Amino acid sequence: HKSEVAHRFKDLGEENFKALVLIAFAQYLQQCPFEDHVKLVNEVTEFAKTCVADESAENCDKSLHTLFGDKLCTVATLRETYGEMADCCAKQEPERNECFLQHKDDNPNLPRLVRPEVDVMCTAFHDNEETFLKKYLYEIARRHPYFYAPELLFFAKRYKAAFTECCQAADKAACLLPKLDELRDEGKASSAKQRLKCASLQKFGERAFKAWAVARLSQRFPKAEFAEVSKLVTDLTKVHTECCHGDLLECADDRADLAKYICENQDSISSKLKECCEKPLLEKSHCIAEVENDEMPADLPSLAADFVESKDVCKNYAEAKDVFLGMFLYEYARRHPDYSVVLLLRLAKTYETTLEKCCAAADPHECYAKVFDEFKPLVEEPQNLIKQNCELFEQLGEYKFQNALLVRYTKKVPQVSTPTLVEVSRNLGKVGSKCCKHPEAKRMPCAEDYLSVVLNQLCVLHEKTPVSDRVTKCCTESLVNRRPCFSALEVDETYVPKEFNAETFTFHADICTLSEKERQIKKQTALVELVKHKPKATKEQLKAVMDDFAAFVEKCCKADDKETCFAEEGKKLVAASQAALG
Numbered sequence: 001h002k003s004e005v006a007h008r009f010k011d012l013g014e015e016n017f018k019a020l021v022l023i024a025f026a027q028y029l030q031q032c033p034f035e036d037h038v039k040l041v042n043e044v045t046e047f048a049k050t051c052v053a054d055e056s057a058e059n060c061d062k063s064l065h066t067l068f069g070d071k072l073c074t075v076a077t078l079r080e081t082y083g084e085m086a087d088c089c090a091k092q093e094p095e096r097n098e099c100f101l102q103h104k105d106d107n108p109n110l111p112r113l114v115r116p117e118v119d120v121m122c123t124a125f126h127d128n129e130e131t132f133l134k135k136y137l138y139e140i141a142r143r144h145p146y147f148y149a150p151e152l153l154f155f156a157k158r159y160k161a162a163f164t165e166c167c168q169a170a171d172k173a174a175c176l177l178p179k180l181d182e183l184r185d186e187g188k189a190s191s192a193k194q195r196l197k198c199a200s201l202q203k204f205g206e207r208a209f210k211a212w213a214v215a216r217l218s219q220r221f222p223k224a225e226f227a228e229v230s231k232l233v234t235d236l237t238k239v240h241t242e243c244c245h246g247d248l249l250e251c252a253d254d255r256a257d258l259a260k261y262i263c264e265n266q267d268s269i270s271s272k273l274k275e276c277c278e279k280p281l282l283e284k285s286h287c288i289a290e291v292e293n294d295e296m297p298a299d300l301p302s303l304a305a306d307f308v309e310s311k312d313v314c315k316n317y318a319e320a321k322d323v324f325l326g327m328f329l330y331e332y333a334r335r336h337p338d339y340s341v342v343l344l345l346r347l348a349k350t351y352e353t354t355l356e357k358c359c360a361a362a363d364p365h366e367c368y369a370k371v372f373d374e375f376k377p378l379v380e381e382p383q384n385l386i387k388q389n390c391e392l393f394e395q396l397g398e399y400k401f402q403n404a405l406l407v408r409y410t411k412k413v414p415q416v417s418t419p420t421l422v423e424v425s426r427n428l429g430k431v432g433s434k435c436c437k438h439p440e441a442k443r444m445p446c447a448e449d450y451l452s453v454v455l456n457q458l459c460v461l462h463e464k465t466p467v468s469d470r471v472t473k474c475c476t477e478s479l480v481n482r483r484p485c486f487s488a489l490e491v492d493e494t495y496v497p498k499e500f501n502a503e504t505f506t507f508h509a510d511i512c513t514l515s516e517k518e519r520q521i522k523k524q525t526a527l528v529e530l531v532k533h534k535p536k537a538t539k540e541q542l543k544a545v546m547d548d549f550a551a552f553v554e555k556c557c558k559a560d561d562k563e564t565c566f567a568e569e570g571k572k573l574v575a576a577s578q579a580a581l582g
């Protein structure tokens, strides 16, 4: 408007305003103390208020970036603490803002943030709700300088809502701790997703991204016209290019403009944007991003007509291959919400691979008159797995099932950090329950969304601590082949069973006194180690020793003494195993 500051304050509101400014500065000045950021926020906020009362007061005409940069440069110890970053204060705005971007650190050498006791958290919440929430928001923000601010804000309110509900409950911990875990996990998945897209836009390219967006937007807005979808994909692409550069304000405006365009064209995109569009800026785009799939028109012909029989097909394909394959993808995508984008892309690639060789023959219509046959095996696969796993996830519960993955993966690539094997296994497990719950129509898309992050996380580690090239092969394979690659790893047969060591299996009674998350992650570390020492063991074998061990501990937690039991009735089990498996 006449003043940017004013305008952002007016529609964001004072409370949200204060919290975003805090997250902003917390992400650059990651080293300064909370108390300092509060002075800052309050200052900036008093100024904002100045521009709201008189939208023409001194300096209110300045742009946010400018103002932001000016405040960053007033920090007395900028150069002493951030050193080179302080040099940014010498450039002329555009360059300055760009300079600040590139100096923001991502590996803040800061201590892991620990979860204090429920009683103290609850007490802290109660005594001073704002300092408590804003303090932790500041803590999460300075350790994650790239986590999109608004989204972090959105998480805070969930944290606030969980304390609010739990701290005044009967069994606080049992109420609170699980919700805090659902937020930690969820919070990590979100961080991972946004870095993955920005990475993909880098690797795979702007085109591949678009292909991905068309598939995704068509499943969500099946009723819209290819032209309409296509318009949204071009915009969606920019939004994410700019956003991936890292400027919070630019990124925010792009998401806002798009969300507004979508709401002003509702009846041309979806009939599911009712709610979201009534919401205020902040929540609007976010809301839209999680909207449900509109229903597809019952009418809808079939792909056969326009993509196989129809004359002009090779003609349409040569005039605009990209737009053409875009329409294929679009038409298929909107008819199949239950497919994972990536699956939709193999289909699209395959179709392309056929028209490329087929429109080169003397009579194509014959060459490609059976493409849809090549599609069946490609679709059946991801489906059949989803079934094999989700069904198995029944016989056994999450934990007992994570123990199946655990063994299966340790035997594929046994030369991998045992604690990385435990994390990945457990993570796959959670993916199994977060999804297998959904109906046979949201499964594949869910898995795709969660398996991806888990897979990238596992590649990032493998990238930093390489070991097995097979994984490397999968980690450097194509966007569309990553998963199948992993799903095709066979048990490794070159493995040299790990040197024995009874210590790795030496246990004590200190475990009859540990929470689930504890007991588990230990019964699982031995299980993994047990496979690396005798990978030639079978499921009947391990499903046996897993019992001779489990029900063994219950016998030491049922004995007057323990230490002896956990060594006496132990070792007795070790030998009874180092024999029954050799």
Ligand SMILES: Cc1cn([C@H]2C[C@H](N=[N+]=[N-])[C@@H](CO)O2)c(=O)[nH]c1=O
Residues within 6 Å of the ligand: 113, 140, 144, 147, 152, 155, 183, 184, 185, 187, 188, 190, 191
């Ligand atoms: C990245 C991220 C982490 N967290 C969680 C994970 C962190 N612990 N660990 N590991 C915890 C630190 O308070 O917050 C969150 O709530 N939101 C987020 O966006």
Ligand SMILES: Cc1cn([C@H]2C[C@H](N=[N+]=[N-])[C@@H](CO)O2)c(=O)[nH]c1=O
Residues within 6 Å of the ligand: 148, 150, 151, 190, 191, 193, 194, 239, 240, 243, 255, 289
């Ligand atoms: C669609 C989607 C996007 N994101 C990313 C993309 C958003 N940025 N942009 N553009 C970012 C917003 O926090 O989160 C996400 O974390 N989960 C999702 O489901």
Ligand SMILES: CCCCCCCCCCCCCC(=O)O
Residues within 6 Å of the ligand: 113, 114, 115, 116, 133, 136, 137, 140, 152, 153, 155, 156, 157, 159, 180, 184
């Ligand atoms: C905008 C974010 C506001 C966050 C307020 C967070 C309060 C978090 C307590 C977190 C305890 C986490 C324990 C853990 O991750 O292991």
Ligand SMILES: CCCCCCCCCCCCCC(=O)O
Residues within 6 Å of the ligand: 008, 020, 021, 024, 044, 064, 067, 068, 150, 249, 252, 253, 255, 256, 259, 281, 282, 284, 285, 286
């Ligand atoms: C002086 C510091 C000013 C910081 C202002 C931050 C404003 C953030 C607005 C974010 C709007 C997001 C809209 C959306 O995601 O759809």
Ligand SMILES: CCCCCCCCCCCCCC(=O)O
Residues within 6 Å of the ligand: 197, 216, 217, 220, 236, 240, 254, 255, 256, 258, 259, 260, 262, 285, 288, 289, 290
């Ligand atoms: C203003 C944004 C409205 C977005 C509605 C999005 C439905 C999105 C499925 C999106 C996958 C998006 C990836 C990205 O945005 O970078």
Ligand SMILES: CCCCCCCCCCCCCC(=O)O
Residues within 6 Å of the ligand: 207, 208, 210, 211, 214, 230, 233, 322, 323, 325, 326, 327, 329, 345, 348, 349, 478, 479, 480
């Ligand atoms: C208006 C935009 C139309 C875009 C049409 C895109 C068609 C993309 C086919 C992409 C195949 C990608 C295969 C791969 O990335 O490995």
Ligand SMILES: CCCCCCCCCCCCCC(=O)O
Residues within 6 Å of the ligand: 385, 386, 388, 389, 409, 410, 413, 414, 416, 417, 420, 421, 424, 458, 486, 487
């Ligand atoms: C020790 C490192 C192990 C890394 C394991 C990566 C495993 C990826 C598995 C994907 C499995 C899909 C299974 C299924 O669909 O039924």
Ligand SMILES: CCCCCCCCCCCCCC(=O)O
Residues within 6 Å of the ligand: 340, 341, 342, 343, 344, 382, 383, 385, 386, 389, 390, 405, 427, 428, 429, 430, 431, 432, 444, 447, 448, 451, 483, 484
């Ligand atoms: C404990 C792990 C449970 C895993 C269940 C995995 C279901 C995976 C479905 C994968 C579909 C992949 C589709 C694709 O890659 O194109």
Ligand SMILES: CCCCCCCCCCCCCC(=O)O
Residues within 6 Å of the ligand: 400, 403, 505, 523, 524, 526, 527, 530, 545, 546, 547, 549, 550, 573, 574, 577, 578
């Ligand atoms: C040298 C002998 C090493 C034995 C290692 C045994 C590891 C057993 C893990 C058992 C996990 C059982 C889980 C369950 O029963 O629900």
